[PDB]
Amino acid sequence: MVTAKKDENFSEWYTQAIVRSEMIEYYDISGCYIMRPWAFHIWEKVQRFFDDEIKKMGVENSYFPMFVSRHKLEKESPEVAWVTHYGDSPLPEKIAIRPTSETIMYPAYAKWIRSHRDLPLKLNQWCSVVRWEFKQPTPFLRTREFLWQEGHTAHATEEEAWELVLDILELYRRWYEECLAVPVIKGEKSEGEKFAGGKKTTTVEAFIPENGRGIQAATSHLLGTNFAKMFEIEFEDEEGHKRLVHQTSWGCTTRSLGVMIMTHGDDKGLVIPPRVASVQVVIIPILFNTGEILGKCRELKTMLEKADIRVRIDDRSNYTPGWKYNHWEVKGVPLRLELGPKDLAKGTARVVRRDTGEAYQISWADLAPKLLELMEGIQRSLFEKAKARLHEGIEKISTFDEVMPALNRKHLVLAPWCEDPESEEQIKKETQKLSEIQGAMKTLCIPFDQPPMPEGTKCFYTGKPAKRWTLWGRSY
Amino acid sequence: MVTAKKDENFSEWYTQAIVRSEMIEYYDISGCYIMRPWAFHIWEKVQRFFDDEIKKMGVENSYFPMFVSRHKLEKESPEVAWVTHYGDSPLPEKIAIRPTSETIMYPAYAKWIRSHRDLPLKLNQWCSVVRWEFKQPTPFLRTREFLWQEGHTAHATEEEAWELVLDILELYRRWYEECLAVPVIKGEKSEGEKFAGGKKTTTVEAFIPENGRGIQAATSHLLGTNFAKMFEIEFEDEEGHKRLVHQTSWGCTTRSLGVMIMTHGDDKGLVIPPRVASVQVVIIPIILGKCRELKTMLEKADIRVRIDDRSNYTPGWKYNHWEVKGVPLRLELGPKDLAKGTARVVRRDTGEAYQISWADLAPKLLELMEGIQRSLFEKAKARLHEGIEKISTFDEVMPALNRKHLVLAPWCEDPESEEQIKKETQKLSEIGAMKTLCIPFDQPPMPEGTKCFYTGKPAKRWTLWGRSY
Numbered sequence A: 001m002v003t004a005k006k007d008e009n010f011s012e013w014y015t016q017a018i019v020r021s022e023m024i025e026y027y028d029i030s031g032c033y034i035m036r037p038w039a040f041h042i043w044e045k046v047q048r049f050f051d052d053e054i055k056k057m058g059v060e061n062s063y064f065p066m067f068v069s070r071h072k073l074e075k076e077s078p079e080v081a082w083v084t085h086y087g088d089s090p091l092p093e094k095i096a097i098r099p100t101s102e103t104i105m106y107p108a109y110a111k112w113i114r115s116h117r118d119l120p121l122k123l124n125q126w127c128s129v130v131r132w133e134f135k136q137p138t139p140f141l142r143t144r145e146f147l148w149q150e151g152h153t154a155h156a157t158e159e160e161a162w163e164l165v166l167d168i169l170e171l172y173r174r175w176y177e178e179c180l181a182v183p184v185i186k187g188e189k190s191e192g193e194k195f196a197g198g199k200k201t202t203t204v205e206a207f208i209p210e211n212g213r214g215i216q217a218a219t220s221h222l223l224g225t226n227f228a229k230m231f232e233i234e235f236e237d238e239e240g241h242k243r244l245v246h247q248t249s250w251g252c253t254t255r256s257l258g259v260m261i262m263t264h265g266d267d268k269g270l271v272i273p274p275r276v277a278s279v280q281v282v283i284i285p286i287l288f289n290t291g292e293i294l295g296k297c298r299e300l301k302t303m304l305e306k307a308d309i310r311v312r313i314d315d316r317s318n319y320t321p322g323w324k325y326n327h328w329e330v331k332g333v334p335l336r337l338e339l340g341p342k343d344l345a346k347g348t349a350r351v352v353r354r355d356t357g358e359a360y361q362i363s364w365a366d367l368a369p370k371l372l373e374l375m376e377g378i379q380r381s382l383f384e385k386a387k388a389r390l391h392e393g394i395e396k397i398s399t400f401d402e403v404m405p406a407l408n409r410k411h412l413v414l415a416p417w418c419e420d421p422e423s424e425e426q427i428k429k430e431t432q433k434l435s436e437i438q439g440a441m442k443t444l445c446i447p448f449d450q451p452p453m454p455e456g457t458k459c460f461y462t463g464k465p466a467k468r469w470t471l472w473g474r475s476y
Numbered sequence B: 001m002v003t004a005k006k007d008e009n010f011s012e013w014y015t016q017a018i019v020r021s022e023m024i025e026y027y028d029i030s031g032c033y034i035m036r037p038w039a040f041h042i043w044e045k046v047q048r049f050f051d052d053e054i055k056k057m058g059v060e061n062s063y064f065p066m067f068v069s070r071h072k073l074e075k076e077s078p079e080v081a082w083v084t085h086y087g088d089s090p091l092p093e094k095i096a097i098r099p100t101s102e103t104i105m106y107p108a109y110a111k112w113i114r115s116h117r118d119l120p121l122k123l124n125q126w127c128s129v130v131r132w133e134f135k136q137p138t139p140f141l142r143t144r145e146f147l148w149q150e151g152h153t154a155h156a157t158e159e160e161a162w163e164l165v166l167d168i169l170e171l172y173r174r175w176y177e178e179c180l181a182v183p184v185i186k187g188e189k190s191e192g193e194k195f196a197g198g199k200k201t202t203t204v205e206a207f208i209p210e211n212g213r214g215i216q217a218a219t220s221h222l223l224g225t226n227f228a229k230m231f232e233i234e235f236e237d238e239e240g241h242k243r244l245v246h247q248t249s250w251g252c253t254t255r256s257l258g259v260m261i262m263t264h265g266d267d268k269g270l271v272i273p274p275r276v277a278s279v280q281v282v283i284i285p286i287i288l289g290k291c292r293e294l295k296t297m298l299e300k301a302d303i304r305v306r307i308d309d310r311s312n313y314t315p316g317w318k319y320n321h322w323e324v325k326g327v328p329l330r331l332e333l334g335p336k337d338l339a340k341g342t343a344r345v346v347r348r349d350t351g352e353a354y355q356i357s358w359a360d361l362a363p364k365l366l367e368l369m370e371g372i373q374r375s376l377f378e379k380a381k382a383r384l385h386e387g388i389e390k391i392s393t394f395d396e397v398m399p400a401l402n403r404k405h406l407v408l409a410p411w412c413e414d415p416e417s418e419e420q421i422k423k424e425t426q427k428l429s430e431i432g433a434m435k436t437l438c439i440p441f442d443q444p445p446m447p448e449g450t451k452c453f454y455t456g457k458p459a460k461r462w463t464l465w466g467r468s469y
């Protein structure tokens, strides 16, 4: 059973919910975690979604090695794990476990690209990534081993690369909004928060109401021509001139599962969106074994599986129905089907939806279509409710004085900002100092969706003219 | 374009082939290779196949960590990679990269398995593995980081575990034989080649005609109860007693790709079985509007098609490129074909050309594709059987090895003998060792007089021997 209350004791709730739901088992190495089926299946669902979508844009998959020579990695960091020996035997030079794959992939890109006919080059990989994170580890959200994909592309023009950046970013919106029912906000990173290797970083950001924190959900970079300068990725154009390629890179990790847990979970435990749940409907026979009820459960299973609904009968002998209800509630199965002798006599079954608790009486013949409609309802309502908590979590302000009260209410702040890089630094400091007295607030993104900006408007901090609205907050 | 000859220098043919098809790029860390799309997509076909099949047996995927603490791994190896630092700082204790995951998975098993209600427990994972191999590395066949799937299961009885050992091994036969059209022999490992932590090790074995080497294609172990005792994987049975569990484990790797390549490849380069080819039919314009219509048509039949309508290459360049890459069928369309209402079609395995009318394409291309696949397999099976010699005594071995053959020979199954045979064969080759590949499930009759071909003692079973990877 789940006992820590979600609003009151968020950290404990989260651990309880991931452990008692059977998603995660703890492990003797810090910041590493076991991903059990109930979590891993969700990762498979989103990997297949995204993979299929990039295969439509002409991206192709590859696998580069997890190892990189120190020489190659330090070409141009305290997080990098170094291998120094195998068995008893010292290596000639230490070797790094990949923390990201630029220094592995880009030298190969310099070899493969010779001519404009080689462009665009579009690759992705799925792989694990290792980083010795300094911060407190958190399962899914921050781990020292995480799973991700990483895309790297090279184009003859900026315009084509930018088109891809945005197309990929829309797929990350989809990953989170369409599969996980988490609402996100597309936006440009500030100068201080963007990938230092690139020209412009775009991002998809999320908000955890229960601790008032923003969190970057995924990232898509327009890298410009600078890696191609560094690594010498050049092409003869059709006029025989030597040109630099234009590059993008993008990634999203097992962090997304965690954001999904935090968003839809409640005091009983998980709530998993139907699109990604391992089991969408659990059949629970009201049994404390004559074979009439399980006979009908099996029948119902077959029937529902014909509509591609994922189903499990919990036919365990030694557990009471109510025990089982709770069990599958902690796991967040979006739908429970109850079948007892009553139900068996009526030709009906009783269905309870995990998001709201609402119960329904449904005739055997209507089950398949009615459970499909219920899952669309559940999926959609999870989203709409989270969207509403997102927009209730953002306070629009005009002045630096509105900042601290807005952070204390566990809110994000949306504010007109001059975008001067020095100012971002000043605001990280000033809100750090002010937080200790009573923690740093930073930029999360400049939203693509800009609320209106009355002609005279001034920066909430410097009072200079204000370019755009920037979304700020405490963050992971 | 490929210039080395497969029957003349095999190593350089292989290198050329996997490089010029754009399957493999070489890398500065020895034993490690870049898998490009053309090779990665074939891995994706066989992974999706096996994955779906183990799902129907109730197996579920997971992901355990790639690190394992010194203490846990060094519990009861020169190949294991050790992490000792983050940035410049050293760790309290060093930490190993997963060479296999018994030591990572089995403590959590001991904790999740309490009763018989919790059995069978069936998990699998896809990951990479790192092993600092001392042998000569070879792309795919033997690499320092390789990709695999490792399956690990726990059962109440040995019967049920064993049942599962064989289901999985049939799935590996299917993986090699149905997807990749590589023929394989199911078998038992001898006591000297079995996984030392298990009871029995079953295997499927493949063969490389051009260097006479056998090669383990995949493996599936009846672990018995010995890991259960060591990790404390006990459960409460029906009667209420504390029973150890019965375990299996099994794995297959990217080595499968290299076996496929070496089996079907020829002097012009790769030949890819239709069942695993990302592109089955490449359409080449030599017009563009009909190419589009034909593609649409062929996809109705689920045929995977690419039109190579890239203007920056000559049609000739395209014939050679898709050839080296092993695309099964190539379809050529000019002005003369356009006005005849037909297409010229060339199959990659035999070079045979067909003239096919637009209406008959989908059914005929489907016919040819089943023929390619059926035929790759069948030639490879005949090539396999021409490579194994039934023998009776030891005096036959060296000549058979020099013909680059395996030998099937009756054996007492004394472990000390296999050891002796290796050294002996080592020494006569110096003047190279031959080991057991497997005891085939398919045993020929053993007449009662018969003697072990080496030691002169009464034989037990027929055993397959040769050099190997």
Ligand SMILES: Nc1ncnc2c1ncn2[C@@H]1O[C@H](COP(=O)(O)OP(=O)(O)NP(=O)(O)O)[C@@H](O)[C@H]1O
Pocket (backbone or CB within 6 Å): A100, A131, A133, A140, A141, A142, A143, A144, A146, A216, A217, A218, A219, A251, A252, A253, A254, A255, A476
């Ligand atoms: N330790 C981690 N565990 C899980 N997901 C992660 C982790 N670090 C980064 N991510 C995700 O991976 C995405 C791209 O990685 P990357 O851009 O390299 O991260 P980053 O910029 O270093 N984020 P941060 O470390 O907070 O500064 C990020 O947007 C995160 O959503």
Ligand SMILES: Nc1ncnc2c1ncn2[C@@H]1O[C@H](COP(=O)(O)OP(=O)(O)NP(=O)(O)O)[C@@H](O)[C@H]1O
Pocket (backbone or CB within 6 Å): B100, B131, B133, B140, B141, B142, B143, B144, B145, B146, B148, B216, B217, B218, B219, B251, B252, B253, B254, B255, B469
């Ligand atoms: N270095 C490697 N690269 C690629 N595939 C491998 C490698 N080593 C083993 N395999 C394959 O993966 C399967 C599972 O590994 P495993 O059986 O534990 O290896 P092994 O017993 O150490 N083989 P070997 O090193 O030849 O004695 C093996 O049976 C091989 O089919």
Ligand SMILES: O=C(C[C@H]1NCCC[C@H]1O)Cn1cnc2c(c1=O)CCCC2
Pocket (backbone or CB within 6 Å): A077, A079, A080, A099, A100, A101, A102, A131, A149, A150, A151, A195, A219, A249, A250, A251, A252
């Ligand atoms: O990983 C990236 C860039 C890029 N890699 C591909 C997808 C994600 C995208 O952010 C950023 N990054 C984060 N963290 C680190 C590095 C680093 O480049 C370099 C090694 C030190 C740790």
Ligand SMILES: O=C(C[C@H]1NCCC[C@H]1O)Cn1cnc2c(c1=O)CCCC2
Pocket (backbone or CB within 6 Å): B077, B079, B080, B099, B100, B101, B131, B150, B151, B195, B219, B249, B250, B251
């Ligand atoms: O890994 C296995 C057995 C088993 N592991 C699980 C799946 C594959 C199956 O063969 C054998 N093995 C091979 N090589 C090594 C080990 C080892 O156990 C232990 C570490 C040293 C290198």
Ligand SMILES: [Cl-]
Pocket (backbone or CB within 6 Å): A242, A243, A244
């Ligand atoms: Cl330029």
Ligand SMILES: [Mg+2]
Pocket (backbone or CB within 6 Å): none
């Ligand atoms: Mg970081």
Ligand SMILES: [Mg+2]
Pocket (backbone or CB within 6 Å): A193
């Ligand atoms: Mg950062």
Ligand SMILES: [Mg+2]
Pocket (backbone or CB within 6 Å): none
């Ligand atoms: Mg080995």
Ligand SMILES: [Mg+2]
Pocket (backbone or CB within 6 Å): B193
């Ligand atoms: Mg061995």
